[PDB]
From a paper:
Previously, we reported nanobodies isolated from an alpaca immunized with the spike protein, exhibiting ultrahigh potency against SARS-CoV-2 and its variants. Herein, we found that Nb22, among our previously reported nanobodies, exhibited ultrapotent neutralization against Delta variant with an IC50 value of 0.41 ng/ml (5.13 pM). Nb22 adopts a typical β-barreled structure, and contains three variable complementarity-determining regions (CDR) binding to RBD. Furthermore, the crystal structural analysis revealed that the binding of Nb22 to WH01 and Delta RBDs both effectively blocked the binding of RBD to hACE2.
The Delta variant, also known as B.1.617.2, was first identified in India in December 2020 and has become predominant in many countries, characterized by the spike protein mutations T19R, L452R, T478K, D614G, P681R, D950N and a double deletion at 157–158 (7–11). Interestingly, Nb22-Fc exhibited about 2.5-fold increased neutralizing potency against the Delta variant with an IC50 value of 0.41 ng/ml (5.13 pM) compared to the WH01 with an IC50 of 1.01 ng/ml (12.63 pM). Furthermore, Nb22-Fc exhibited increased affinity with the Delta variant RBD relative to other variant RBDs, which is in line with the increased potency conferred by Nb22-Fc against the Delta variant as compared with other variants. To elucidate the increased potency of Nb22 in neutralizing the Delta variant, we determined the Delta RBD-Nb22 complex structure at a resolution of 2.9 Å, which revealed that two distinct mutations, T478K and L452R, had differing impact on the binding K478 locates outside the CDR binding regions, and does not disturb the interaction surface. Therefore, T478K mutation does not affect Nb22 neutralization. However, the mutation of hydrophilic leucine to positively charged arginine (R) at position 452 significantly enhances the interactions of RBD with the CDR3 region of Nb22. Two additionally formed hydrogen bonds, T30-R452 and S33-Q493, pull the CDR3 loop of Nb22 closer to R452 region of RBD, as revealed by the superimposition of the structures of WH01 and Delta RBD-Nb22, explaining enhanced neutralization activity of Nb22 against the Delta variant. Of note, the guanidine moiety in the L452R mutation forms an additional hydrogen bond with the hydroxyl group of T30 of Nb22, pulling the CDR3 loop of Nb22 closer, and leading to an extra hydrogen bond between S33 of Nb22 and Q493 of RBD. Consequently, the BSA extends from 800 to 835 Å2, in comparison with that of Nb22-WH01 RBD. All these contribute to the enhanced binding and neutralizing potency of Nb22 against the Delta variant.
Numbering used by the authors:
A (entry chain E), D (entry chain A), F (entry chain D): 334 to 527
B (entry chain F), C (entry chain B), E (entry chain C): 1 to 130
The structure:
């Protein structure tokens, strides 16, 4: 009956941002204040709310979105951003109430030869809508010649790998990100607090 | 996979004037982020690059094969193909695959100007004989 | 895939009395809508039909191979298999794949009766020797 | 803000009808009359609603389903039809309030050697339910021998390709189809008009 | 598939000192529940087990190949690879695949002490010569 | 218009429990008595509902989950069970109102050489939530060295085949299972009685 936050922050691997992972957290009594005790989070921004004002007011939905991106893209995890991540991978609504936690995962997610197992979407014919997920892999038409499923010049495969190395700089190091969404919809209550 | 491996398949015994398509499967990352080249070493001779392709999908070829060989990219299968036409007996070699990563600030640079690659395959042998 | 492509794999050097399974991979459409035939070209001789299968999955065979070869369908992988048993040296050839579409008003028609296909593969060579 | 309906109508490739695509409109202002001006639509049928009182009526949901079928099958995209498409690919309910737009796409979807990239379901053990989507590819038992995953006689793969060629006749030519469903359910409203 | 089949691929003609990776793909069940072994039949000689792996992924090897050959498991593709290095001419053989199911009350148990297998492949030939 | 229970119980193939199948039964009048009259069911336990009140009761939704397991695991298909099945394949909530039907399918699902086509999940880093479905195939870390996607010692593929043979004993024979979940929400009822 406990709220299992341990699984969301202690995991061995995270999702790729293009195929980002969403987990519903329902039917749970939670303690939220003992999570902020970890002052090792390099990023911690909450929208429509202050970081210590949610122990009595409850909301019906709690989603744990999580993925990995590199240091220079973490700025895009916010309502109203642009860039490959914000527009082609993970987009937050403008009226988004929730929190954005990020921390540097270099000792975990990189290896000496490079760790090319996390991917992102480089190209897309239009921006995502908020919380849309695109897992398709069709050839991207970057020119006036139609690509016709075949790869070639101006006909690119839309997904790339991040190259994560321990000697990379901060803008190029892996950052694990978790977005908590507290939606204002109506349904029987699921999530409690301290 | 902790490391990028490259496996070549398709090696066969074929006849002079034959054709053959070699493949280079990859695991560990998106091969569409790596520049890939093909090399051969005939019996007793030194390794030579024959063809390569970069992340913008432009090909380069050696003169011993220019007009006969075609390098091609199938990234839904995470592979690079090498279509070899008009095989003559002197194409008998072990055909190896090789790749290196292209980071974002270098996506326009070309290939077989990187004859040094960080990841190699073991090769699949092609024998051209009567 | 703008056109139906057909790729053959599985060719090898094998021994008399050996066995071997060729496959015909297809892209561009559902191979379960095409009639598929296998052909062979022995060195210096003309193409000869060997086997075929239609959209109702009924096979026909030439007599020179009847009882040794089995044509079979795996369209969840979009391929057609050719299982070859009891290989004797005179089976040494380049084995090619070929296909043509069957529109709705003709799905109940047989094969190696038109013996005319629009789409070809490049072939995979089989050599039978000791 | 405004809804660019072009996203549903302008695509380079369409879905196969068996795997028909659905695009939701989350919250958008639309202009409906300047689309009906295109009298170059071979089909424009509206059910449960008046066909030119479309800027005054507001609706809770807006779904845009779209796919490709051949010309003689367009008769089947309607409430209460039969045929392989209506029963095995895309079925509309009998109380369907919405519109069915269709147009001939021969110059787009056909190729001289044939275009064999669009698929449909030929066989199914039972009819779909309204707005159900079946993407499975299990061997179809058309005889008395059980198929056991293997293809053979009376054991068929359920999906076929359409052969779209520029010289085909109209009943065999490709038609792009877009279906708009206007749901009146209890939830926040999404799409209004001018 | 009604029954477990096993198909071997990767056989080629290769050179002494070459290397080659054979594969054993399976259908009909999860290969991760079977003990898998590799055998070779050189021309005119009897089968010899060369290598095997059990369900907890421990490998055992024949004396003739220990240190050159490596058997390994990729069951996300429902296959078992046999990596063969440093090929000498006397490795010219037909390489076959073989498997048997390990039921729950026997998951801790070794291999090539159970050379009895229910399921065999047809073999893929490896020829090593100059 | 009738509620199709025959199609859920008379099917030629069943799902594997790890990838168990779900079917919604909606917008239909159901026939319950001609199913309970069949005393050929090896198991028929109902929770939160009486088995002969189902002709008076209307429900908004009815879900038909079905799969195959071996005989002595049938014990685990109940609210509050443990074991590979209950914890790693198919878990029921404690507040489950519905029925669990099982019957021995040895004559169908066994083969003389063994039938290894049904699978189950052997390993998992945490228990499922009620009605969660896990179809992923990540390498399972059973040791202290990280597995890194590669299989080896203490690094196992999570799925196994059931070995169904006709000479197995009952605890090892295939049992087809169907679970009926009768949902009551505040919404129009869809499935009533005769």
């Amino acid at each position: 009956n406990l709220c299992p936050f341990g699984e969301v922050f202690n995991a061995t691997r995270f999702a790729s941002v293009y195929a980002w992972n969403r987990k519903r957290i329902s039917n749970c009594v939670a303690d939220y204040s003992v999570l902020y005790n970890s002052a090792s989070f390099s990023t911690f921004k909450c929208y429509g709310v202050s970081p210590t004002k949610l122990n009595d007011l409850c909301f019906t939905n709690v989603y744990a979105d999580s993925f990995v991106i590199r240091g220079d893209e973490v700025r895009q995890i916010a309502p109203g951003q642009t860039g490959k991540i914000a527009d082609y991978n993970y987009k937050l609504p403008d009226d988004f109430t929730g929190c954005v936690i990020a921390w540097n995962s270099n000792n975990l997610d990189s290896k000496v030869g490079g760790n090319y197992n996390y991917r992102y979407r480089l190209f897309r014919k239009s921006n995502l809508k908020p919380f849309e997920r695109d897992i398709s892999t069709e050839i991207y038409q970057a020119g006036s010649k139609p690509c016709n499923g075949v790869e070639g010049f101006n006909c690119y495969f839309p997904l790339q790998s991040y190259g994560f190395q321990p000697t990379n700089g901060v803008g190029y190091q892996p950052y694990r990100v978790v977005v908590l969404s507290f939606e204002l919809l109506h349904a029987p209550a699921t999530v409690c607090g301290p | 996979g902790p490391q990028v491996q490259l496996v070549e398949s398709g090696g066969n015994l074929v006849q002079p004037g034959g054709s053959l398509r070699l493949s280079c499967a990859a695991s560990g990352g998106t091969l569409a982020s790596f520049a890939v080249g093909w090399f051969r070493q005939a019996p007793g001779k030194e390794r030579e690059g024959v063809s390569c392709i970069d992340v913008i999908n432009r090909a380069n070829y050696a003169d011993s094969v220019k007009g006969r060989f075609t390098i091609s990219r199938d990234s839904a299968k995470n592979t690079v193909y090498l279509q070899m036409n008009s095989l003559e007996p002197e194409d008998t070699a072990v055909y190896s695959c090789a790749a290196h990563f292209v980071p974002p600030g270098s996506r326009l640079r070309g290939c077989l100007v990187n004859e040094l690659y960080n990841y190699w395959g073991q090769g699949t042998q092609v024998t051209v004989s009567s």
